[PDB]
Amino acid sequence: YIVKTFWKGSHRQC
Amino acid sequence: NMASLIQRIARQASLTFRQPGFPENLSKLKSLLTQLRAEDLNIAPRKATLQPLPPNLPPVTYMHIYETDGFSLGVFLLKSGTSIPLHDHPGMHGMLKVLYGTVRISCMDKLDPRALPPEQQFEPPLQPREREAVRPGVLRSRAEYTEASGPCILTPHRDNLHQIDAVEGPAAFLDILAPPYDPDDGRDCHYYRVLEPVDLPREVWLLETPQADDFWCEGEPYPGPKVFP
Ligand SMILES: [Cl-]
Ligand SMILES: [Co+2]
């Protein structure tokens, strides 16, 4: 899934 | 009384990243990061498992400590044999400090845009869409860093691309990003490949690439002293 993060931008967290 | 070192780091990061006064504030922030040790964050150094990494576990995890509109503050924890792939920090400054372990940090920049010469060949060969998309860059440095090294700095215009490899076991670093990434504001994290055609600094070829299938980062709880408003 994609999460907008402060620390890796639009990150695919999987 | 005396605030925790991580609270003082956050306070100083806020002052530095809200211009005259910036260099002096950045120097003070660097000096605070120089003093930081893993024990000041209640993070015990992690050592290798000597077992293969199962498919359901991330190669890297992240502990968030604090963020404001001006900066983000946290820790990345790399398992043995893992890398954070080559990536940029558009329009941002960054400061990192190794907490335990050894990392190899490769530092690069995109150059000005010049096109790939027609006869240039790569190994592995490039697909047609990749040949159109590759752009020139410069490899500025590639060195190993430990907790005894100073902090490493990047800026919007220098060492803005970096790759971080865990060397000879797990490693972790504190990272400050200023401002934080903001995809909705044109500040996303882009990944790149450096290509081998067929002495530093030296010119390289850079290809923007999707996040690798075997790289992702999951959060885990931060165990150290908390940063308070
Ligand atoms: Cl490990
Ligand atoms: Co980075």
Residue numbers in the entry:
A (entry chain B): 1 to 14
B (entry chain A): 5 to 22, 44 to 137, 144 to 229, 240 to 270
What does the primary publication say about this deposited structure?
N-terminal cysteine oxidases (NCOs) act as enzymatic oxygen (O2) sensors, coordinating cellular changes to hypoxia in animals and plants. They regulate the O2-dependent stability of proteins bearing an N-terminal cysteine residue through the N-degron pathway. In animals, the Cys branch of the N-degron pathway is regulated by the NCO 2-aminoethanethiol dioxygenase (ADO), which also plays a role in cysteamine catabolism and taurine biosynthesis. Biochemically, ADO is a non-haem iron-dependent thiol dioxygenase (TDO) from the cupin fold family of enzymes, consisting of a conserved double stranded β-helix (DSBH) core in which the active site is situated.
To overcome these issues, CP6 was used as a molecular scaffold to graft substrate moieties, anticipating that its binding and inhibition properties would enhance substrate complex formation by increasing association and reducing turnover. CP6-L8 protrudes into the active site of ADO without contributing to binding, rendering it a viable site for substrate moiety installation. In the first instance, CP6-L8 was replaced with ornithine (Orn; O) or lysine (Lys), allowing the sidechain amine to be coupled to Cys or serine (Ser), the latter of which is an amenable substrate analogue. This generated a pseudo-N-terminus with conformational and rotational flexibility, which could reach the ADO active site metal (a distance of 7.5 Å). The association of these CP6-substituents was assessed by SPR using SCK, revealing that Cys and Ser conjugated to a Lys sidechain enhanced binding relative to unmodified CP6. The Ser residue of CP6-L8K-Ser coordinates the metal centre in a bidentate arrangement through ligation of both the hydroxyl and amine group, leaving one water molecule trans to ADO-H112, which is the putative site of oxygen binding and activation. The water molecule trans to ADO-H112 also forms a hydrogen bond with ADO-D206, which points towards the metal centre through an additional interaction with the amine of CP6-L8K-Ser. The crystal structures of cobalt-incorporated ADO in complex with CP6-L8K-Ser and CP6-L8d-Gly-Ser provide valuable information on substrate analogue binding. However, they do not reflect native conditions in which an iron cofactor interacts with an Nt-Cys residue.
